[PDB]
Amino acid sequence: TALQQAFDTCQNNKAAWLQRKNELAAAEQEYLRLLSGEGRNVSRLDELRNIIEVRKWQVNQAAGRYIRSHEAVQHISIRDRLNDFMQQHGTALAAALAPELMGYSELTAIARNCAIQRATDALREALLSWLAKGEKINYSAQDSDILTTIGFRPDVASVDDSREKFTPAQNMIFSRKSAQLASRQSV
Amino acid sequence: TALQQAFDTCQNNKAAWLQRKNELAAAEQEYLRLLSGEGRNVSRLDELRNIIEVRKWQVNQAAGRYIRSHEAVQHISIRDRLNDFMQQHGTALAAALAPELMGYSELTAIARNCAIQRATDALREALLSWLAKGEKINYSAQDSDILTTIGFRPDVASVDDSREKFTPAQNMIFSRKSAQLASRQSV
């Protein structure tokens, strides 16, 4: 039943990412409003710059978390859907692959790897031709609702906001700065 | 009828390789019979050694051709069986794998490559799990007799006699010698 946990984790990550996004947006609109004012407020200006940077880093982290959770839930859906499909048609699929993987357990590790490699690239051209027919298909009936709610692909905002990457030293220093800012805003 | 052509071509190659080994074996039998004799026959000994080596090369070539035909017939049988089976079950197969194959043609080349790679390792894990369950695999009912005639693996003779490889220079040298020997023997 881990699919439900993955789905709710993905939903929570998406909600947190959206909260980071709109909080950051409010932050930069307030920063623009303050800089447009006559008052110099240099301390206010550079503390708002620091806030902008740290909130943008938090948005990047939340987007990365959401992408990873979406990939994890998609992987869980793929694995259990393939599990039930394999339970349903394993004997027939093996009979299709009988010239290749017959006596699989009675073989060494490297021979097993080579045999399954032949099986799977044969499956490669099989699926290539099947899709090259040109038909259109929908989601699996059992878990259609979850996969439709999470979507085929994540949001473009989640991918273009997370395209930038930080070195581990930057990650550590921004984590420290975010903790300091959280402590400051808590009090 | 392509499978029938592969089958009888493999049978012809197997018969030719059997004839090659029979001729070679008679060759060293006669060579050792002459060597055991007290007659000098030095030129006869040298030409019989040439006979032995050219027959060994011919046996190697015949075994290699037979192995190649075996691989070809196994590959075509796998292709046909896979085509039939997953043509039958492709609706559920692609429903299980939908979250990554939506809009495959509309997607770009790198997206296509990523999607097919994800499909591949999903099938990897599914088939290795099924094989880890350990139930026996049987040949397809439609082509059981043919696959039993060819068999899962060629004879051990074909694989140990062809272990050694020949450089191209030796290849056409031996081909020329074999042609000359066939020409003289036909007379």
Q: State the end-to-end CA separation of chain A.
A: 41 Å
Instruction: Decide which structural class fits the backbone of chain A.
Output: mainly alpha
Name given to the CATH homologous superfamily of chain A: Phage polarity suppression protein monomer
- Total domain count of chain A: 1
CATH fold call of chain A:
Methane Monooxygenase Hydroxylase, Chain G, domain 1
In N-to-C order, the SSE pattern of chain A is HHHHHHH
What is the molecular shape of chain A? elongated
Q: What's the level 1 CATH class of chain A?
A: Mainly Alpha
Helix content of chain A: over 70%
**CATH-level-2 architecture of chain A:** Up-down Bundle
Protein name (chains A, B): Polarity suppression protein
Keywords (chains A, B): Late protein
Organism (chains A, B): Enterobacteria phage P4
Function (chains A, B): Late protein which functions to suppress polarity of amber mutations in the late genes of the P2 helper phage.
